[PDB]
Design an enzyme around this catalytic site. Sequence first.
Site, mmCIF file in Angstrom:
data_model
loop_
_atom_site.group_PDB
_atom_site.id
_atom_site.type_symbol
_atom_site.label_atom_id
_atom_site.label_comp_id
_atom_site.label_asym_id
_atom_site.label_seq_id
_atom_site.Cartn_x
_atom_site.Cartn_y
_atom_site.Cartn_z
ATOM 1 C CE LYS A 198 -5.099 90.500 58.925
ATOM 2 N NZ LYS A 198 -5.750 91.668 59.584
ATOM 3 C CB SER B 10 -7.383 90.069 62.660
ATOM 4 O OG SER B 10 -7.575 91.091 61.696
ATOM 5 C CB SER C 31 -6.983 94.187 62.617
ATOM 6 O OG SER C 31 -7.962 93.317 63.167
#
Length: 487
Positions: free
Chosen positions: A82, A161, A185
């Site tokens: 990420k 997220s 997330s």
Amino acid sequence: PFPYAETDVADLQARMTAGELDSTTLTQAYLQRIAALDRTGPRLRAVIELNPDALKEAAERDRERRDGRLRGPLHGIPLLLKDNINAAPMATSAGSLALQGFRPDDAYLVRRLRDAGAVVLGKTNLSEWANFRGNDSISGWSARGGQTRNPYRISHSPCGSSSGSAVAVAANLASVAIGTETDGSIVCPAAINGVVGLKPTVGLVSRDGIIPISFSQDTAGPMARSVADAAAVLTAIAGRDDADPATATMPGRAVYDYTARLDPQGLRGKRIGLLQTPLLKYRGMPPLIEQAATELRRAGAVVVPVELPNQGAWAEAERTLLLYEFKAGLERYFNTHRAPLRSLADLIAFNQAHSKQELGLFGQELLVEADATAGLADPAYIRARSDARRLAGPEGIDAALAAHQLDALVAPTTGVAWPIRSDFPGESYSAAAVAGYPSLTVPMGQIDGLPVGLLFMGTAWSEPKLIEMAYAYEQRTRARRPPHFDT
């Protein structure tokens, strides 16, 4: 048909160890697929930046293998990170144009992954600033990475997220990926994209080198197509780090192999509480959750309906602690890694100066509210941090576990993906996030072609048990189905 589609880490490792596959071949295969599905074709936009040294890394791992110097289970395995996790030589932008040229050194967990022999393919897109920027935000969107799309239906949301990481794993753009969670997330996008997501206990995995939101709730975690793959990744990233005090709070930490917990009889004798919330009546959900409960029982577990004490009572306190910790943490991060931005005020000013590219879809209200917080010494913040943790953990998850002597709590993770160009009541994952406790979602089916997941939550440090239970459930259901692309 992609030759490595749905292939587990252990199998890829076995193939390379048998000399039938090498890291460079596997790595280039993923890169070619990324070019065909992420950058072109359906344009999933899961990958925000490729690692220019990916091939070099893969080739070095292969040379080491030929030299008889293996690093472990992940030797030569390609993965994605990420984009809020520091990893040289790529930038770490959190999806913002403000950090497009910011390239900090490897985060602790990345150093661990590379030492373990993993190959970093690149970084994945995420809701800008891990969705802590403004109100009415769009999941999976960032100014630098654009809009990530759900591979099961590209018009629909990948959630967030950790949008790109979930999509990349679901679309077989890498073997595994790393995401981060503050509140939903990891598990939400994992469920929404039909993959496994594991958010560990806060403190199991170092948060050093990660653009933060909350030191109280933040944690990186694995995202994979299978529980076994997630366990392999957790084994490599878990560990004490002097730079992250939370990792020193773990009781009896040891060099633990989580793959040893992949027990097909892992549900035998276990006691599970099925959380009662409106989500059980979500359109199309009844048949799926009923079947899941039956599978759990047939596997040997006792499943009883229970209500989570204080469900959602921590909402206000959580909002407060996140605002205070975000300002403090972000500014500390900017200083520690010498970013081009030195304060939250600088970021707010940057977005205003670049309003056309940054504030066209929604604003930056959370940044603005966070910047106005006094500091971590504020009594209101101290009370909020304490109340949230207490309500969700000791008097929340722990109270439910103790009331019926349960090993875990389960429930549907969330609803299904929604049209991007347009919150499901009854979710329970917030409890684990706020308590800093472990949670893990496993695919349990689909509704109208869109993935739905089964969430498992336990008390602090119960990852071994959660993995045993999740694996046992997964092995008798094997519900995941890969996404179907037009061409």
